[PDB]
Design a protein around this ligand. Structure first.
Ligand SMILES: [Cl-]
Ligand SMILES: [Cl-]
Ligand SMILES: [Zn+2]
Ligand SMILES: [Zn+2]
Ligand SMILES: [Zn+2]
Ligand SMILES: [Zn+2]
Lengths: 61, 62
């Protein structure tokens, strides 16, 4: 996934570490800060429009 | 920026890192969904932090 290393598609600054979770699937295209704002404002997933169940701060060990 | 995100699953060394191991509010992404599901199914902890595995999230990269 060559886009995994590109910046947050919302702020184009921070890395993609704000995983938007819904059930057993996640869309990772946004930083924790950007993804938390969406959760806080009760917005859906930007790409699939499923509700945001949680934000997971994603590390690549 | 996490340049290691595009390296393969550290377990099978084949499939991409799309098996996010979730525990509390954090996730360790270093394994494919297949490999991460086997760990969860067999009730193993997170390979790198040993926290219990709450869930595996099949991670897509829009
Ligand atoms: Cl959250
Ligand atoms: Cl699971
Ligand atoms: Zn952002
Ligand atoms: Zn989504
Ligand atoms: Zn694997
Ligand atoms: Zn862990």
């Amino acid at each position: 996934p060559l886009n995994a290393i590109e910046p947050c598609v919302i702020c184009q600054t921070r890395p993609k570490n704000g995983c938007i979770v819904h059930g057993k699937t996640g869309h990772l295209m946004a930083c924790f800060t950007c993804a938390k704002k969406l959760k806080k404002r009760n917005k859906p997933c930007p790409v699939c429009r499923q509700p945001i169940q949680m934000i997971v701060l994603t590390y690549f060990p």
